């Protein structure tokens, strides 16, 4: 059946406002005249793609029996000279002459661009034609554009398209409402908690919920395609009625899908777990606590009346786990994640760089909550004064763009910026002030217990000889780093593989699992060529930075 | 029979199942989809490298499925008159919808659908908005599914990449060894083969080849076989004897010849001029030769062993020593002998005058390296681009620092890191940044010392391997007399 | 600032026209070290685009008579990179210096920041202020 | 010819290419020679205008798409091949790249014999010395 008003969710105030604007001045014209007002000429709708605009238009078309007249934006043009203006004029004339109708203009930006900074001439003619006609009762026009700033400002004025309605992304309750709306005509079996699914679904807006539902359903359909050996010759009967979507289907779909807004910046899945990051226990605990509180129970902060810090900087020597911690956060934080590499955004053209910075930060704010990991800040946020070289002033301009989009951050949207550099000396002192990256985490060289935990975390998924004492490796190893331990285990693995290949070749030669696990001798031989990655001067510099 | 079927494409099974699902299941068992209320996806976007097989998939769907099929080439829709492009799109969609449940295919959608924000030509933005409305809107679509193909999906307007318009994005990516085996079996199913041919070795030795590359390989092999017998019988236009027309038999040697000529199409631009050198040309330094060959040949020949332990291989090496010890010679030997692809890079080659193009160049080279993996990347004179991050205040706005940061992130960052082997060669290892010499970037620091007496003797024997000599000549004296000499002297 | 040619100065131009229209107004220019960059610092440039922006600003700020009574607020962290041509008196004269808070100022700041804070009744911020001496307001 | 296809009018370059290929295929087993392809086949990412991107996409679709070709061969000439769209440098579109490089001594002698077959030479002129002393001559 036709989409009724119940079919929309996640927008209470906006839908109520649209109902007030569209129904009352059309269902009761006499009462408005008695009060002494008149209906507005038009109403604009804007917002991110896939939010419910077109849904709202069809719901208004269905609920009210008033005559309707659709004119899609790019459908007003014509090859014949000036027949486009005549078409639009005849559209409005028919809409008025027939009845107190309602007109919905979809994608107006295609036929309502800023009159200045244009090249064609028919576009100006149609813009002026619509401007003068709709500038001249009991009929209202609804415009729905995905990008509101590409409109001729002459239309954004009293008397013509005066009432705007910010159709935004939903909240948790609205998203749950949408989930309920879509799941009404579906077999949910008996084990499902949509409240948890909405609390975990963070950035999705409107249609993305439908995508989630469809994907979960598809997974369920896949489960019963071959497990029952479904006959492709003709349809089975009893299996069709035994279809029920489980929780695992929805979790599987959620683990695959991503918000449409972040679809461009999707990062390839790299598996890491919180037990994989050996050592640094307090750092992981503090990071989890600081990142989880604003999203899990902000009411405590509201009672406290103080907003949380939304930035953090990892600094320390190379090969300690900064990128490892960031990757683990990307994997197991239950929030969106945008990874950027230092000189990724810069471009030769003038301004494009800052355009990229604004686009990325806009994407971060849109799919809130989000965690943008800026790795190697010594490229985009180096010392402003230190950069004496005048590459045309681009570096200062990008630094200022980053400051304006990082310091101009409201309490809403909870965007957490993680910085990570191995040289803390190069970052501009403006950055390292509270309000942008207040917290400063230092990742020191591992200690004996930390080193043992790191080792156990590295070769956890590696069969090894049972009588092996990792504590020995940790002992007599003082200045090493996690990367060095990785090098040691990789050397041991290489020696084991070499022994395996030699034994297999010998076995094949004789013929025509010798080494199921790594022997202690492999580890003994791997340690002959192990050296510290970081010298003492670097440690001196980092200690000086810490003490300063 | 000649028409491509689903059996005529291989190397990608998951994506094949996904596309078969979307195109067939709502048109073969609709009641099953009527059972649960939710409707199936009705829009799919295929994206991937250029010669991966996207258009082949579209052709297979068109040939196999019994539903109506309508074809839209990318620039084909647009026309000169002012209001004709949108009229063409509307007419196309109306034709597809009116006739039957149908599949539209939009080939090279990147030409029709720009970002709608960076573009400046009006007609483009009106055609994009017309597409947006036609594909989704009031009375969106009855029983018509839309397939699009592109090579750069990031150049598409985000409004198209939303559910309802393009619901699922399938990635037709580079095959694997089993994929290359399947492709080879597909393309050699009708040609005439000699019994000696062994396709498994060919699939193993082809590294980074994607789709059409395999076809090129077989075609070249055939061409060589034709150029082996055309010398026997020639310019007999009226007729060719049946003894040579039959019993052609493309030998395995032909395939080896064609494999030696060709290279992965992705690396077409960055091919290195063939400088043939063998392992016997490198005298002395046997242990370094063994370590290098073991460190390169094990991950590419014995993947099962690494998985059995579940530990990643080391993927770095740095040669350092006095000039002329044999670093570049070792790199040349690796380039000529090892089966993996070779990327030869000079020191300052990657720098550029403009702002940001140096790091763009680095990203492109590493993108090619990660595309045709397993690959070897040789950074000659690594001290040229990777210098200590001293700030470079009296420099080109610290462009060297950004280059070093780009290299750092590219060799170890948010990447899958499948198989890229970086080889460094510097005669000044003190100027290299300490943040690259740690393990995980360049794991093995190999010192190439000055040759000893037996190493000088080995070098002398190696360098005279193709020269006629005096019978009584004893090179042992020359070795005994040179104490501090190097290979170059 | 914009990539295309001419458009940049047009954007500064329409914003200042809008400012002139809705007089009185307060145009807040944050981070002038990006707009008012040291004139012609080095020959190496994008294309005198920073210089064109500065000239557009100079011609559009000198045409401020008594009428329309507009007021431009600047705010920078690094005052060393501000062009002297725009800091000249009669163009942009007033120079307020905002120093770091002192102990009494820090206590006032803390009391203003803890207005909407259900603090424990048996708590006083005077100790923190007396101890925290070189602590900025952000601290 | 290379830039022979470009038109001021919007959506006409591809019309010219389509008409050309249709004419080539409608007649007989034909050959299409496209001279100086670097002017109508750039990298599609360094360019900014839309008409070049669109013409390149039309060319790519023409050379390899549904209903690809039927006994027609495309030949191309270029002075710098690295500045060509990678999507064109693959089997099916441009199967093999022939390298027409500088001749060696024998090649130079062959060229000299070719170019001096219509002149009235003296008896005292030999070409072997001439082919020897000429080193970097491209023919």
């Amino acid at each position: 059946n036709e989409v009724g008003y119940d079919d929309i969710g996640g927008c209470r105030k906006q839908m109520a406002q649209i109902r007030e604007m569209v129904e009352l001045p059309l269902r009761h014209p006499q009462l408005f005249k008695a009060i002494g007002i008149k209906p507005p000429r038009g109403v604009l709708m804007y917002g991110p793609p896939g939010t419910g605009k077109t849904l709202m238009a069809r719901a208004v078309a269905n609920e009210t029996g008033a005559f309707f007249f659709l004119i899609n934006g790019p459908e007003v043009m014509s090859k014949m000279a000036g027949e486009s203006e005549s078409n639009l004029r005849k559209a409005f004339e028919e809409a008025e002459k027939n009845a107190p109708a309602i007109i919905f203009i979809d994608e107006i930006d295609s036929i309502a661009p800023k009159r200045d900074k244009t090249n064609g001439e028919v576009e100006r003619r149609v813009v002026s034609q619509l401007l003068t006609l709709m500038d001249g009762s009991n009929v209202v026009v609804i415009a729905a554009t995905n990008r509101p700033n590409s409109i001729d400002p002459a239309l954004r004025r009293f008397g013509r398209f005066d009432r705007e309605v910010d159709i935004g992304i939903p909240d948790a309750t609205g998203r749950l409402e949408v989930l309920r709306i879509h799941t009404k005509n579906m077999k949910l079996a008996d084990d499902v908690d949509l409240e948890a699914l909405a609390a975990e679904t963070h950035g999705y807006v409107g249609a993305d919920i439908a995508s989630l539902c469809s994907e979960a359903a598809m997974q369920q359909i896949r489960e019963k395609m071959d497990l029952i050996d479904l006959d492709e010759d003709e349809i089975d009967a009893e299996v069709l009625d035994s279809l029920g979507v489980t929780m695992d289907n929805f979790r599987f779909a959620l683990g695959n899908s991503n918000p449409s807004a972040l679809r461009e910046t999707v990062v390839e899945s790299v598996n890491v777990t919180w037990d994989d990051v050996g050592g640094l226990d307090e750092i992981k605990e503090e990071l989890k606590e600081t990142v989880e509180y604003p999203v899990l129970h902000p009411d405590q902060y509201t009672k406290f009346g103080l907003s949380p810090s939304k930035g953090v900087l990892f600094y320390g020597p190379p090969g300690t786990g900064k990128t490892l911690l960031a990757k683990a956060v990307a994997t197991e934080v239950s929030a969106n994640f945008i990874s950027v590499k230092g000189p990724e955004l810069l471009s030769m053209w003038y301004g494009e760089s800052e355009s990229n910075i604004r686009d990325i930060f806009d994407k971060a704010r849109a799919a809130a909550p989000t965690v943008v990991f800026l790795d190697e800040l010594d490229s985009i946020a180096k010392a402003r004064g230190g950069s004496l070289g005048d590459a045309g002033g681009a570096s200062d301009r990008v630094v200022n763009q980053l400051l304006t989009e990082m310091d101009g951050m409201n309490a809403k949207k909870n965007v957490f910026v993680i910085g990570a550099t191995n040289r803390p000396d190069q970052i501009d002192p403006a950055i390292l002030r509270p309000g942008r990256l207040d917290q400063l985490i230092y990742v020191p060289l591992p200690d004996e217990n930390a080193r043992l935990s790191i080792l156990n975390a590295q070769l956890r998924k590696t069969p090894l000889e049972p009588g092996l004492e990792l504590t020995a490796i940790a002992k007599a190893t003082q200045g090493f780093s996690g990367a060095d331990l990785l090098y040691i285990v990789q050397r041991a693995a290489k020696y084991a593989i070499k022994d395996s290949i030699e034994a297999h070749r010998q076995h094949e030669a004789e013929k025509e699992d010798p080494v199921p696990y790594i022997t202690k001798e492999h580890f003994a031989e791997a340690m002959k060529t192990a050296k510290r990655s970081v010298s003492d001067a670097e440690l001196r510099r980092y200690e000086a930075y810490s003490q300063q | 029979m000649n028409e491509v079927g689903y059996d005529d494409i291989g190397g990608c099974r998951k994506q094949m199942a996904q596309i078969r699902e979307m195109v067939e299941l709502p048109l073969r068992h609709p009641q099953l989809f009527k059972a649960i209320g939710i409707k199936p996806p009705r829009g799919v976007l295929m994206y991937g490298p250029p010669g991966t097989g996207k258009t082949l998939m579209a052709r297979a769907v068109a040939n196999e499925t019994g539903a109506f099929f309508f074809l839209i080439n990318g620039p084909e829709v647009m026309s000169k008159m002012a209001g004709e492009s949108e009229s063409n799109l509307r007419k196309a969609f109306e034709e597809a919808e009116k006739n039957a449940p149908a599949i539209i295919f939009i080939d090279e959608i990147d030409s029709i659908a720009p970002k709608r924000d960076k573009t400046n030509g009006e007609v483009e933005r009106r055609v994009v908005s017309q597409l947006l409305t036609l594909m989704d809107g009031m009375k969106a679509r009855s029983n018509v599914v839309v397939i699009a193909a592109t090579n750069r999906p990031n150049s598409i307007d985000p409004a198209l990449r939303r559910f309802g318009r393009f619901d699922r994005e399938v990635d037709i990516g580079i095959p694997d060894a089993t994929g290359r085996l399947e492709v080879l079996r597909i393309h050699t199913k009708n040609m005439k083969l000699a019994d000696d041919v062994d396709l498994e070795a060919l699939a193993a030795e082809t590294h980074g080849y994607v789709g059409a590359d395999i076809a090129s390989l077989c075609s070249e092999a055939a061409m060589q076989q034709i150029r082996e017998k055309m010398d026997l019988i020639d310019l007999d236009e009226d007729e060719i004897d049946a003894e040579v027309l039959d019993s052609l038999g493309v030998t395995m040697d032909n395939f080896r010849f064609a494999l030696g000529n060709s290279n992965p199409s992705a690396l077409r631009e960055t091919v290195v001029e063939s400088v043939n050198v063998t392992w016997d040309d490198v005298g002395g330094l046997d242990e370094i030769k063994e370590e290098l060959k073991e460190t390169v040949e094990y991950p590419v020949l014995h993947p099962d062993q690494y998985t059995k332990f579940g530990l990643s291989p080391s993927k770095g090496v740095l040669f350092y020593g006095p000039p002329g010890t044999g670093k570049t010679l070792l790199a040349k030997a690796v380039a000529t002998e090892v089966s993996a692809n070779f990327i030869s890079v000079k020191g300052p080659e990657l720098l550029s005058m403009w702002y940001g193009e140096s790091e763009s160049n680095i990203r492109d080279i590493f993108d090619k390296a990660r595309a045709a993996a397993p690959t070897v990347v040789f950074l000659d004179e690594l001290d040229s681009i990777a210098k200590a991050r001293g700030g470079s205040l009296g420099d080109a706005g610290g462009a060297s620092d950004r280059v070093v940061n780009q290299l750092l992130t590219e060799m170890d960052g948010m990447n899958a890191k499948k198989n890229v082997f970086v080889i460094g060669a510097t005669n000044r290892p003190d100027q290299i940044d300490p943040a690259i010499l740690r393990p995980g970037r360049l794991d093995q620091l190999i010192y190439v010392p000055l040759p000893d007496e037996n190493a000088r003797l080995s070098i002398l024997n190696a360098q005279l391997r193709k020269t006629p000599l005096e019978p009584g000549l004893e090179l042992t004296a020359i070795a005994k007399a040179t104490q501090g000499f190097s290979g170059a002297d | 600032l914009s990539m295309w040619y001419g458009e940049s100065e047009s954007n500064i131009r329409d914003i200042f026209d809008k400012a002139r229209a809705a007089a009185p107004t307060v145009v807040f220019l944050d981070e002038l070290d990006s707009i008012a960059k040291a004139r012609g610092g080095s020959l190496g440039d994008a294309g005198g685009a920073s210089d064109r922006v500065v000239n557009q600003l100079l011609t559009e700020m000198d045409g401020m008579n008594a009428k329309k009574n507009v007021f431009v607020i600047g705010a920078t962290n690094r005052p060393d990179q501000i062009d002297p041509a725009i800091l000249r008196p009669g163009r942009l004269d007033q120079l307020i210096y905002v120093p770091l808070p002192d102990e009494n100022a820090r206590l006032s700041i803390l009391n203003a920041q803890l207005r909407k804070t259900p603090l424990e009744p048996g708590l006083e911020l005077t100790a923190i202020a007396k101890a925290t001496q070189g602590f900025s307001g952000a601290d | 010819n290379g830039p022979e296809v470009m038109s001021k009018m919007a959506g006409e370059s591809e019309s010219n290419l389509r008409k050309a290929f249709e004419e080539a295929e409608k007649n007989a087993p034909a050959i299409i020679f496209i001279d100086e392809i670097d002017s109508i086949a750039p990298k599609r990412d360094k360019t900014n205008g839309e008409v070049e991107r669109r013409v390149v996409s039309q060319l790519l679709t023409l050379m390899d798409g549904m209903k690809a070709r039927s006994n027609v061969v495309v030949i191309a000439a270029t002075n710098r091949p690295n500045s060509i769209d990678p999507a064109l440098r693959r089997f099916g579109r441009f199967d093999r790249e022939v390298d027409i490089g500088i001749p060696d001594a024998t090649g130079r002698l062959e060229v000299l014999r070719i170019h001096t077959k219509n002149m009235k030479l003296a008896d005292d002129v030999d070409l072997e010395a001439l082919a020897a002393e000429t080193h970097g001559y491209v023919g």
């Binding site: 053209w349 070289g389 590459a391 | 005058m353 403009w354 702002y355 | 190496g44 294309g47 | 919007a10």
Partner: peptide
């Protein structure tokens, strides 16, 4: 009848220079 013409003229690029400090 009218017609729509396309035009794409140019843009603005940024160069990078090297300096020497005495």
């Amino acid at each position: 009848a009218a017609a729509a013409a396309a035009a794409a003229a140019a843009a603005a690029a940024v160069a990078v220079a090297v300096a020497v400090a005495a």
